Symmetry: T
Subunit: 106 residues, 12 copies
């Protein structure tokens, strides 16, 4: 998937999680998010296409994705314990990480 498609997967699955009422739907959505983020961390955002690959910006992009992966993993961990509301709250807190990256590079 291309970077924009991975972002759309992330966005769609937050909506699924928010409206879900059981752990299976939540786990499935978080698993799709994990895969999208694992594909996206190695991408180059359009606004950074002219920057050195080892630039502070590109390193910060990767770091932010690795942090998002950690938070998705932790939300999935709650969902695998069947803690639906807690997993949903963790997914809501994810948005702060999405937004922080977007402010810099989207």
């Amino acid at each position: 998937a291309d970077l924009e498609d991975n972002m759309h997967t992330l966005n769609d699955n937050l909506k699924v999680i928010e409206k879900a009422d059981n752990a299976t739907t939540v786990k499935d959505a978080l698993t799709k998010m994990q895969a999208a983020a694992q594909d996206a961390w190695s991408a180059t955002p359009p606004k950074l296409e002219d920057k050195s690959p080892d630039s502070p910006e590109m390193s910060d992009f990767r770091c932010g994705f690795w942090e998002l992966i950690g938070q998705i993993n932790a939300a999935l961990h709650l969902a695998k314990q069947c803690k639906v509301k807690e997993a949903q709250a963790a997914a809501e807190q994810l948005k702060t990480t999405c937004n922080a990256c977007h402010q810099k590079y989207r």
Copy 2:
């Protein structure tokens, strides 16, 4: 597994490695440690529950876990070459990384 259970897995398997006398027992123990550390790096320690997820502390927690993973992988690499004493010595050196994190966040 919860964070404390992953730590207990790490602790138990260092003891197994120290007393082991063959590469199979060592490889098995290191594989369990690898899995425990892969589950733990995305956790939030109790003493950091009120901190921002992107805080210097939380980033340092993750970094320390990624370093521990690298050292476990390298010890496993020795054990897979059947170098039992060298793998045991690498596992002993792991303790410095465990202790360094504990001084800050346990």
Copy 3:
């Protein structure tokens, strides 16, 4: 594989990619590079054997390998879309990351 063998795998596969004329050969070569880099990031270079594992040098070594992994993943992503010339150009740009690390630690 030992560190030097992983480097040889990386070097051999850049040569394969450069001369290739189809996506299958390129994808295969990049997959071998991905595996070599995943094995190598946890190694200790000979020139850093006496340094603390958490030293700035060792952390920089790991970081550089994680960056190389990201660039390999991205080249593979192009090749999986069958974009042979673009994947070859991405592999050529990899060399800057190889060389930057070598200047410091080889």
Copy 4:
């Protein structure tokens, strides 16, 4: 996934297919559509919740989905032969089946 989510998947993947430039993207998108249609054909749409399961309406609903599945399969058959433009044209033509069902039951 619930019926609304499966419909969203179908729509998203039509857009991916239309903008695609390689067979890998197209095949993956059509495979996702196949999965969504296989999940959806046994669902009950809101407007038919009070009808007999063997009503003309529910039978017509199932028949339209089996039609859609066949057309997706045919498009995927083109994409597996790497015929990107032909598979894109088949995907565009699917829309008549989407619209026919929506006119009756959405």
Copy 5:
């Protein structure tokens, strides 16, 4: 399995579902029902042996089995969301399809 044995499987598993108190038991029973229905839909029942394979009676028979499969799938979808009572109600609802076919052909 022969037709009568597949029917006995369907009947046994509806009773298991009704008595169940958790989603695992329900899911396991519905999966057995799926398999029995997949194996039965292509059979010729005793009272239709002297009809043409393309006869309206045989076509009606196959159609009824396909509607049964859809309803079993829909009940399984609820059970996979851990909705035990809803899946149990869906399982009672599919008795309508059992009954309709039996009325004509058992």
Copy 6:
């Protein structure tokens, strides 16, 4: 395989079954027919290329293939019970389903 290839596979395997003398050969042949029919039911025959995808012709074509699949499955069921002659007789009778569709659409 295109529709013509799938029809050739069906015809080849009827001949294999007729001349066979053991259940293994018959089961394999019937399994190949099942796969060919599964790939063919979603095709559009040449003489229906100008009909709507939901035309009465196309829906009759699909219905005939589902009939054929059922009769193949039923023959395979006899072969799986090692009833060679009965499975051969069921395969021979398949010809009336082949012929009926051919009269209309071949």
Copy 7:
């Protein structure tokens, strides 16, 4: 499955074996009995719910189930050699093991 369900499975499959006419049906039925007995041997029958887990009754119950498993395995071995009538006769003789346990604990 609970103990009653496992006993129902055992009884259903004895009847399938008795009426069967080929090795495939017999092998499948015996495989289902093996699974039911494997799930049942660890159960506590109602009439022993008040006995110590290590009581002479409970140990006699487990011993009878291991006997039954052995005799099922031996019947399955005959069926796997395609010896239908011999496997049917072995299944019939199983009844003396069923009955002996029932006299004491059912």
Copy 8:
């Protein structure tokens, strides 16, 4: 794992089960106990190293482990039905089997 390690595993997982608040944790812990007991039943405890392999003592040792395995399996059967509190009570009751063997052979 050696006998001492398998005993440690059994003890650790009893504690995990007692403190657990969801079926996933309980099922995983019971699965680990099943594996440890399957490894241990064929071991020779230090105090019996000079006894015949068919001695009353070694036979009693094996019998006690087969008992334990049955009780673990029964507890896991409850946990697979998501019956957390009931599975916890079954795990607590296992301790009588642990203690009975320890009194004789530890």
Copy 9:
């Protein structure tokens, strides 16, 4: 395999173990012995054919096989730790169990 053939397998593999000079050969032989013992324990030997299946003789026969399986497992556990000489000594030790059963029933 029949009982005599499983016995021949056990005998051949003890000799392979004694002559072996490495753990791979020993492990492979012990795994073959496990399979032969698993297949034999449910048989009725010629000298016991006219005994009841629950007779003391048949119970003794099954018990001896279970003790054999435990001893093969214990030897395999040593071989998996690469302890060739210890596994070879364990393999000689299990001749006691072979002999005891043969004394009574061969």
Copy 10:
């Protein structure tokens, strides 16, 4: 499959290859040819039934099949590199090996 049926498979798939317009169709046909050749090389053809199995004629027959297998592998290697026209030319070239054997033994 019997020898004649494996020959028919080889012949059908050469024609599929010639008519193909993409590498997937070619790869699939060559894989079927590999399997048919692997199954045929050990057969005795009618015109050689009264020759010794080590006769020059039978040795020549096996040799020709091994050369065929190599040429099918080499054509498959081209097709895996997506070189459709080159793989098609390699497929025409292997008719020399078909012809040579047929000259002597068909």
Copy 11:
């Protein structure tokens, strides 16, 4: 297995086939012979240890084993068609290939 072990396996399984009364036993035995021959063809017999690896002797040895493999495969093909007596007769005839090689190199 060393060459002597592989030859013992070949001889054991000829005897199993000769005394067998069903296709399952024959197929298994022939499958074990196939594996033994596959492991043996690359060996160097004692009486050729002093010959060049490419000597006429060693190449004749390899050729005889490829002959044997072909005849084993052909016997297995008959067994897979459930032709027990024909497969037994093919196995008996294998002895002329065994004997021819033994006369030269055993």
Copy 12:
């Protein structure tokens, strides 16, 4: 991989084997050589591109590769028994086969 790359693989792995100090490295290297030789035996070397596929030269080329495969398999058989020095000596001896073919066809 093309023929030149497979030759490079063979040469690289001889060097890995010669410098190795453990069986894991040796086994992996020999496995890679086996794969390279299996790919290469069906290739056509540049100097033989104008020869008949059944020419003495091409037949000799295939025969030399089958020899090489046998010798690699024999070396791997030693390495699987953990006989590092013996496997290294077998790998060194392979070189005579490499050189014999190169003298004729490189």
